[PDB]
Design a protein around this ligand. Structure first.
Ligand SMILES: Nc1nc2c(ncn2[C@@H]2O[C@H](COP(=O)(O)OP(=O)(O)O)[C@@H](O)[C@H]2O)c(=O)[nH]1
Ligand SMILES: [Mg+2]
Length: 186
């Protein structure tokens, strides 16, 4: 079962730190220069023996100075939207990120919100107000230490399969790739 997922959120919030791990393997990843994105395949086996593959797109840093192309979003089944709990700007732009994603994919596709860098803070209240009170499934994570790495994917698999009791029975390779694919940004 295969789903495209977009990572979104301001530059510096930890998107690349989160995803840029070995996962299904370095060689399996792909780069698309037209879009400015790397695909990271991550496969989990569930409790009923289904193979669930997420093709998780990450930017090469262009969000720092520019708007992402529609092709980044097109075909996505879901998004993981990050902010940095130590920076209010990143929280403020959450509604803008949601609108940008939904403007291409529509309002049904699940968006999971991750409060990142909880290891280092912006209250969840501020998130709720920036987002006009709309509910999104919400996790506190540390992309650095991989704390709670699986939770957004577990939620997404449940939505997509319709099985609220779906669990992952395989463990993912969480080693950092040591591959820097980011464009230099002065
Ligand atoms: N302390 C801490 N730093 C993080 C975490 N995730 C990312 N960073 C740092 O934040 C900076 C931006 O990370 P990056 O993954 O490039 O963010 P992106 O621009 O959203 O892809 C880097 O210096 C990372 O080391 C985290 O969970 N904790
Ligand atoms: Mg990045």
């Amino acid at each position: 079962l295969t789903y495209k997922i977009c990572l979104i959120g301001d530059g510096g919030v930890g998107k690349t730190t989160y995803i840029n791990r070995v996962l299904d393997g370095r060689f399996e990843k792909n780069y698309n220069a037209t879009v400015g994105a790397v695909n990271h395949p991550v496969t989990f086996l569930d409790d009923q023996g289904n193979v669930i593959k997420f093709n998780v797109w990450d930017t090469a840093g262009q969000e720092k100075k520019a708007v992402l192309k529609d092709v980044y979003y097109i075909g996505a089944s879901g998004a993981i939207l990050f902010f940095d709990v130590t920076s209010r700007i990143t929280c403020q732009n959450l509604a803008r990120w949601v609108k940008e994603f939904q403007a291409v994919v529509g309002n049904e596709a699940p968006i999971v919100v991750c409060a990142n860098k909880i290891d280092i803070k912006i209250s969840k209240k501020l998130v709720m107000e920036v987002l006009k009170g709309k509910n999104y499934e919400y996790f506190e994570i540390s992309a650095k230490t991989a704390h709670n790495f699986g939770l957004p994917f577990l939620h997404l698999a449940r939505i997509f399969t319709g099985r609220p009791d779906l669990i992952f029975v395989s463990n993912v390779n969480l080693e950092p790739t040591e591959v820097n694919y980011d464009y230099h940004s002065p």
